[PDB]
């Protein structure tokens, strides 16, 4: 199961923020899919979800600005937030949602279920009560996609190798001089997660950010290459840098 968000990581104010979620591992007509966001330093905010039949739930406070659509042929679900502002700058998460409705039958004041019918003390048949229990929860989360609502300019990073001078080998990548945030780094296309450490970026007075990702690997890896994969979504740029200790 994989949920991959995609769409403009940089949105100009007042324009319609739009995002897409592509799924794999399951058919979109089999599971409910939805959108939850989190702005920096704030609570999780449910945006909405859509079910296999088109049944749609929307955040009551944002309903007038939200649009969630489904495209089964492409296994995709779309989100749209009209008239974007700074309040809409946030990490947007695609989600798979467990939905279920239970019909509950019970007997009213002073009766019990002898057999199948609600019978009272004297044995008179009484109508049952029908209520519903509702089940909702997120059973799979996407990695999330940071969207910034601003008119900022764009500069793609340079990526340089980090290697020590000359028992574990420590190396990395310097992602130099980009804007705006963020940048994401993986190693060996995600195959290398153990020993990885990506550090928050620094900000120069020039307005450009830089950050570094480092990895520690056993010494018995001489000659091996390790590739850092850097994404700068704001500039729609992706850079792979192969690092081999000397």
């Amino acid at each position: 199961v994989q949920l991959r968000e995609s769409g403009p990581s940089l949105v100009k104010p007042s324009q319609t923020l739009s995002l897409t979620c592509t799924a794999s591992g399951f058919s979109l007509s089999d599971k409910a899919v939805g959108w939850v966001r989190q702005a920096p330093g704030k609570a999780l905010e449910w945006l909405g979800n859509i079910d296999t039949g088109g049944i749609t739930g929307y955040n009551p406070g944002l309903k007038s600005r939200l649009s969630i659509t489904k495209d089964n042929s492409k296994n995709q679900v779309s989100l749209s937030v009209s008239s974007a502002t700074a309040e809409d700058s946030a990490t947007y998460y695609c989600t798979t949602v467990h939905q279920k409705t239970l019909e509950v039958r019970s007997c009213p004041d002073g009766s019990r279920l002898i057999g199948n019918d609600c019978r009272n003390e004297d044995g008179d048949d009484v109508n049952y009560i029908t209520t519903f229990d509702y089940e909702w929860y997120v059973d799979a989360w996407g990695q999330g996609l940071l969207v910034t609502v601003s008119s900022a300019s764009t500069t793609a990073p340079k990526v340089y190798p980090l290697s020590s001078c000359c028992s574990t080998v420590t190396l990395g990548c310097l992602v130099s001089s980009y804007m705006p945030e963020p940048v994401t780094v993986t190693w060996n296309s995600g195959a290398l997660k153990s020993g990885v450490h990506t550090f928050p970026a620094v900000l120069q007075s020039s307005g450009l950010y830089s950050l570094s990702s480092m990895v520690t690997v056993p010494g018995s890896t001489s000659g091996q290459t390790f590739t850092c994969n850097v994404a700068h979504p704001a500039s729609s740029t992706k850079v792979d840098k192969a690092v081999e200790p000397k």
């Binding site: 409705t101 929860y137 997120v138 340089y160 190798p161 980090l162 001078c165 990395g172 928050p200």
Partner: protein, 213 residues
């Protein structure tokens, strides 16, 4: 919004509880979920259906519910449990959802941890552009505060230095970076540069020499 305490705290290896208060139409309907948020990671589903644990969730996370109040209890607290915890429930239909206000869990009594420090010289490629960035990476320290001093040939450097604040890692310890931005000529003119990181009165020094890089 479901009512949670903004903040809650417990001591290492002990037990803490986080409550989640709602009404008959959400929590009272009887299917509450709990989620864990660590920085640099996506939200993690911990509990569903009041009491059930999701895949990969240790037994020391447990949930329960009494009427309109649900409770997430964490026993045998570890440092990695420091995080934001949110409850959620359906509301009047299985398509309509409500989240809680969130609770920040702090774990008290964590041991002191010294920083691991790595100093990287500028790459040949960057030097080819007449730029030279020295990168000092600082990780795995607790509590979250370090002071950084740069030196070259015995003299302290202050200009062209940029140091990040301490930020929390996924393992609950802290990290930080410091960058010394020089020209290639500046870089070649000295015999050695050093990053000196002080933490809780202890000092770590790392050094690079242009004649060896």
């Amino acid at each position: 919004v479901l009512n949670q305490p903004s903040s809650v705290s417990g001591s290492l290896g002990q037990r803490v509880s986080i409550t989640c208060s709602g009404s008959s139409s959400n929590v009272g309907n009887g299917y509450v979920s709990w989620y864990q948020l660590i920085p640099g990671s996506a939200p993690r589903t911990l509990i569903y259906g009041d009491t059930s644990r999701a895949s990969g969730v240790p037994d020391r996370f447990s949930g329960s519910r009494s009427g309109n109040t649900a409770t997430l209890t964490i026993s045998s607290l570890q440092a990695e449990d420091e995080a934001d915890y949110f409850c959620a429930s359906a509301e009047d239909s299985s398509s309509n959802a409500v989240f809680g206000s969130g609770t920040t869990l702090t774990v008290l009594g964590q041991p002191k941890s010294p920083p691991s420090v790595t100093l990287f010289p500028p790459s040949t490629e960057e030097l080819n552009g007449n730029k030279a960035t020295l990168v000092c990476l600082i990780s795995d320290f607790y509590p979250g505060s370090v002071t950084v001093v740069w030196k070259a040939d015995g003299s302290t450097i202050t200009r062209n230095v940029e140091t990040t604040r301490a930020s929390k890692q996924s393992n609950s310890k802290y990290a930080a970076s410091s960058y010394l931005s020089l020209t290639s000529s500046d870089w070649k003119s000295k015999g050695s540069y050093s990053c000196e990181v002080t933490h809780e009165g202890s000092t770590v020094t790392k050094t690079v020499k242009p004649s060896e890089c």
